[PDB]
Symmetry: C4
Subunit: 436 residues, 4 copies
């Protein structure tokens, strides 16, 4: 029975595996737990999940799947500005609803004022829908397949493809923007070159942009932040990797809408070994979030997430969202082809600081992870997992979990190594592990 | 030389392997140590041993063997109410003594008032025994095989099968109820459905019932407790898994006769890894027992028992009884068939939260343990083991061990990892381990 | 720079591998270091080495070799009183000097008053030596082979075999008694039966006797101690295994001449795992020696010695001598035959609490260790090793090492696990280890 | 956020792997970081790198390569004084510039006053250079191959081989002495014999000499130091291995120009295990440097360097330079021939206290390390690695890093074992590691 303030303010250099959250009182069911989380000062998702901007994790496929399930994805920038922007465009155009370009096809089969060819099938035998209706109305109005929206003068003002109404109805947690499109985020560097790439990403319709760096507390990123906030006042920007409040302050002052917290704890990271710099994750998350919260800036616990327990712990310590690399790297929607080794299906996963991904000092390693299946199955599982944890701890929502932790109400307890060994599977001659 | 109060009140998150009990003064022999322990507020066994309510551990066979040796068993509820109740009935009818149903056979060979056929062999050549005698008397009275008990009017009032007098004489530590039957306990859930199952278990003659849950401090279990205490005033109820005094208080207030303490420390448990919730065992046991004792509520140290040292430590820290899963899972009396792998005989052992035992979030794993032989050999061994420990520590009884620990008299000392390595087998090129 | 008092009085439960001794000032050579140590209140050896009383370690061969090199041995009692006593007799008669029985052969070749046949070779052609001379004189007096000692009346008063003068001259560190015989010690239990065995051991000429027990603070051993001190006033007795000052006090009060300190840290020990009782060695040694010293009672650091560093640390913490089991178990002089496994020569080593060595609760395990060669090579090596350690720490003698440690002058420092890893061999692709 | 003073003054016995340096503010690039470091009170290198004086590490080849890249090398003394001195001579004569001996060839092709034959090619057709010019001038003056330097009377005063001007221009970081020669250092013992060897090393032109010992705080080394400072007033001397301020003081008082800090932490070291003496490196480095700095004496962090992180940490804690053995032992320039095992190329690496390198008490082990390539590639890599670390921590130079650490500005944080596990590569099914 120790509070977070007490636990993380003794200088022990703790991490996720070094502690536990003590159970509380249950008076609701796991399915009643709400995971709504703030991605940035203005982006809010239904789940606190985010896919990392890496070669072997996030591209269109992942970004789309992740958005459809309740989270969001960040496309990597280890490609051409053109390619990256196309990946953003694919994601952005995956779901639209009221398509305008192809409806105003252009007018200026169907015979809808102006000269809207979609012509032959005259505007009398065809079903139409008034302007001002909503997607719900739109769906029923033509319960079949193929809906031309008409503006007073009976002029084609828009159209809505049945397929979009399907995707919309199929994914109730979909992270969509004001235009009913799957929101997407992208990662860029801080060199001048990144200004051009940013412009192409802007044109692509990217919603949030993260400045990629192992140590984001620099004059380069600060000025880059200020630039972006100037050129694109509304664009949501996330600050480079930080692990201390002093670093966060500079980026917060520069104008960040959120912070990416984590240094050298990612599965493929050797920065701590090579550069001696970094910080134990659990502590990094608590300290920066505790600070950043006084400025309304969401913290993204980035790195070291090996399972659901970690996710719940990051959130419990102050993080608004959690970013994963390896916990998603082997899913169907991640970049790369599957292969086999010792009868084990694998997909490549490599650190962005690896010589391959990149005198060059390698800060990442290149490996492979075992097949995790589809994001469409895995993410729902993580969502269920997180919910149960909130239940045991007695919290109906992630927002509540933090209040309980900050009020002192939520208690923790350190785990000795024997205690960590006891917490996992032990004393078995053999066993298999499954979760969903 | 550190007291329990000092040791477990520093927030280190200790477990069984993290400490030792310092030896005292010996002025008696190991065989003089008494292990009588309170299972619940009213159930008291000769030993502090209990078999866990799990698919691969407890069914009739185990429950019977465990009772015969001095402990008790809890039948799992991962079966039909009918099946479970039949398992309780088998155990309950294993030993009876004065059988009534078949003696009042019905009257209304032998020719005993009324019309008691057991007829031919007239009541004159046959040996009979008066009503009011005891089992001891009964045994001698017909020193052979096949004893009709007669009520004044020479009317068949009961019978006693020689076989029961045998089982009774063979097992001096047998956990029997007021009717000379092997007591049995069963595990149920907390859903409404469990009320029906409970009723069938009541009819079966179950003696103690444990409410099965990974986090028993809930409104569901509290109300279930209150229900049971109402409907079955005398039934002994044990509260769902708890690890803190605050949780215990709710269940104690709800009316529990004992508490099942343990969360995520069981050999097949992944709850700590998946849900981030739980608590290091040694500490869980000391803290809750220290509290629950002020209300006369026995604590069951449930989980993490890998050997005799653990059992003795749980007891020394405040537990009245100890529940095991893996330490019994491979015995002859446990559910399942034996098989072989690398020339090693094994029997399945799986967590009740495993996908097999059961979106579903797995909290347990499915494995196999190596053959441990019969409960009838293993339990006596654990009993001997525990006794020696009490001797080294200078305690003639489990009751004494707790007094010494609560008075400060009993001392402990933390074990560094090197100290733990030194405590076990080391520096050998090869070795085999045996214990009994 | 931490003193022993500070280091071992924080309740951390440390052991040998958990700390280091910081180097001092060197103004002498390793060969100038003196290891003279008190075995008991009256037995003093040239080295602080002792072989453990175990089936696979100490018998005549070991006891003799160990004495010849500067230490001593304790014969095991897992044999008949006759056998054990014969093992003591073999050791005792290995070296004698002035043999009396065969010289007083009996008188009452050579023609020496009385009728000393050793006859033919008359007392005139034969060289003789006066009574009152010493062994040194004796050696030169007949610089060849085959010396009849003559008493005034020219009567055979004794004889001295050339072979004894050889053994005496060959081993300058030999642990011999007042009669120039290799001293020997033996281990006995505390049951009444041990009184008879003790008597046979007395007749055998045993010099020191250790009462064998895993927990020697008992009324059984206390009374046994008092008995022995009564019956054999001069016999040196060592107290059963203790690890705390409170235990030591009882045995010290009972009249022990030394204490055997150690519980569950021996390579083949499972007492800590099975009985939950014991104590981390380094701490056990410091605490009891710190106490026992106030009564002039030598402490024997028994158990957990895996190498020279451990020996030096035990001594530095207060032990007067060190007892080993595995560090000697595979030498030529130890009981048992050598065999081979994976091309590796081995000799059996088993705990005295193993089922084989012995319901029975096993407290020891049965294994094998790799061939260490002869005690006559290994012990000199340990002696050299210990000497260098004393040099680095700036102590010319074991006696000095303790003064420095008790005065505060000697400093220590805890070793984190990484620090322990760094202290040993690391970062090699492959390597072989040798020491002498 | 803990200062070095706080971190290393709690008695925890920390080492490199036990802590991290928290990142600061970046306002410069990695390539702008300066690694200029003081080898001794008067020797200053461009990099803080030094090759250890060992059989399998440093000989001419290594010493030359190491100097050319920015560091320095110390030739081992496990050879004849003649051999060692020849190794110094090879290194010293590798690069010269203004060669005098062969130019004053002797005078007393070319026809340059006196009788300088280099004769035929008369002094009129040949290009010459005035005395007083510099190497830069010299290079251009004869932009081709084959430059006779002439003194007023047109007398051959010196010569400069084109090859030297090449080596000079190729290696901008070259550690050269006042005579434009690659500086070299050598290791000697402290016995009288070492005085002769020293004399031969003096004649060889050695620049710095390190007194080789595992425990240099001795009367032998102190007097040896005083001797050398007397006989060779200008010679730079480094004090034997020390790990505490008390030891450093004696050697500092004796007159050391630098200190070699480290005891039993070297990859091939078993001194801690065998002699129980030594100290955890990170702590050894901070404590002695913190002291030695008050006397302007540079500390050489010697031992335990397994990678770049360690190097940066040693420097951050107070060391002026870092000495490596295994981190260089398998390079092309190190002594020994390459061989193969399991398809892995290896080169021998052995501790100088190994029986092979040397009753003898082994303090080192004999193994093999995997091929690291050329020093000419590896050292530049370490240089780049160190620079990035300085960048993350916000320091433009090693000198700055220490100021920040001593002022309190630089912060650190302990790493729990889980934190250390998280810091390295984890959660991968497989991976390969590369760095340059
Ligand atoms: C160290 N860290 C690196 C590198 N590339 C990316 N990253 C990071 O780690 C996170 C993924 O870690 P997981 O544990 O797999 O989730 C990424 O989000 C990013 O912060 C690298 O080369 N070295
Ligand atoms: C975690 N714990 C589980 C699960 N099923 C049962 N249990 C528990 O552990 C105890 C057995 O642990 P042992 O160390 O084997 O004695 C059981 O009594 C129960 O508390 C599960 O799926 N996950
Ligand atoms: C535990 N300890 C046992 C047993 N038999 C003997 N001993 C002890 O350990 C010492 C030898 O330990 P090493 O590390 O090998 O030196 C013996 O002197 C004695 O104290 C046993 O069965 N269990
Ligand atoms: C222990 N230490 C030894 C021995 N020979 C040399 N050394 C030392 O270790 C350093 C090299 O360690 P690395 O980790 O490989 O750099 C050398 O500089 C020297 O101090 C020995 O036999 N035992
Ligand atoms: C940039 O991607 C990362 C991130 C996000 C992190 C780390 C890291 O090593 C890399 C790879 C390192 C690279 C590509 C070098 C460029 C740079 O320094 O930004 C880390 O330690 O924590 C977080
Ligand atoms: C119920 O059986 C348990 C018990 C007793 C414990 C744990 C656990 O995971 C399960 C399996 C988890 C299940 C079947 C999910 C249902 C539930 O939540 O009750 C644990 O962590 O500590 C104790
Ligand atoms: C007696 O030999 C030992 C000793 C010396 C020790 C231990 C031990 O287990 C045994 C074997 C245990 C036996 C033979 C049971 C009898 C007894 O209890 O004496 C230990 O834990 O520390 C020291
Ligand atoms: C001398 O080389 C070393 C050094 C530098 C160190 C150690 C060591 O064991 C040896 C080998 C030990 C030898 C050759 C014995 C001679 C001696 O004692 O000097 C160590 O522990 O720290 C540093
Ligand atoms: K990492
Ligand atoms: K577990
Ligand atoms: K042991
Ligand atoms: K080492």
């Amino acid at each position: 029975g120790l509070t977070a303030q007490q636990l993380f303010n003794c200088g022990d250099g703790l991490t996720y595996n070094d502690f536990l959250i003590l159970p509380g009182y249950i008076d609701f069911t796991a399915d009643q737990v709400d995971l709504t989380s703030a991605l940035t000062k203005k982006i809010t998702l239904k789940t606190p999940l985010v896919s990392s901007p890496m070669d072997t994790v996030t591209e269109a496929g992942m970004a789309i799947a992740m958005a459809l399930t309740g989270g969001i994805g960040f496309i990597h920038h280890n490609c051409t500005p053109e390619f990256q922007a196309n990946e953003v465009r694919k994601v952005k155009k995956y779901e639209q609803g009221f398509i305008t370009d192809p409806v105003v096809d252009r007018v200026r089969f169907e015979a809808k004022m102006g000269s809207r060819l979609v012509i032959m099938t005259k505007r009398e035998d065809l079903v139409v829908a008034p302007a001002g209706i909503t997607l719900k109305e739109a769906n029923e109005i033509l319960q079949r397949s193929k809906l031309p929206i008409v503006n007073e003068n009976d002029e084609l003002v828009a159209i809505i493809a049945r397929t979009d109404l399907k995707k919309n109805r199929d994914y109730p947690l979909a992270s969509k923007d004001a235009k009913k499109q799957l929101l997407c985020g992208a990662a860029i560097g801080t060199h001048e070159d990144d200004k051009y790439r940013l412009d192409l990403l802007a044109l692509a319709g990217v919603d949030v942009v993260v400045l990629d760096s192992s140590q984001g507390n620099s004059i380069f990123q600060i000025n880059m932040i200020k630039y972006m906030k100037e050129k694109y006042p509304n664009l949501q920007v996330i600050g480079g990797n930080v692990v201390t409040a002093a670093q966060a302050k500079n980026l917060i002052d520069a104008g960040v809408d959120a912070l990416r917290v984590g240094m050298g704890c990612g599965s493929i990271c050797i920065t701590q070994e090579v550069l001696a710099c970094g910080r134990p994750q659990a502590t990094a998350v608590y300290k920066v979030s505790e600070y950043a919260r006084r400025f309304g800036v969401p913290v993204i616990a980035d790195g070291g997430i090996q399972n659901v327990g970690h996710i719940a712990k990051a959130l419990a310590l102050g993080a608004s969202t959690v970013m994963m690399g390896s916990l998603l790297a082997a899913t169907t929607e991640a970049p790369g082809e599957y292969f086999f080794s010792d009868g084990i299906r694998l997909k490549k996963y490599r650190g962005m600081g690896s010589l391959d991904a990149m005198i060059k000092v390698a800060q990442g390693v290149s490996g492979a992870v075992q097949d995790k299946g589809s994001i469409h199955k895995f993410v729902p599982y993580l969502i269920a997992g997180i919910q149960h944890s909130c239940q045991d701890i007695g919290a109906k929502s992630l927002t509540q979990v933090r209040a309980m932790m900050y009020s002192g109400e939520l208690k923790f307890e350190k785990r000795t190594s024997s205690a960590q060994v006891e917490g996992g599977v032990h004393s078995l001659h053999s066993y298999e592990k499954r979760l969903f």
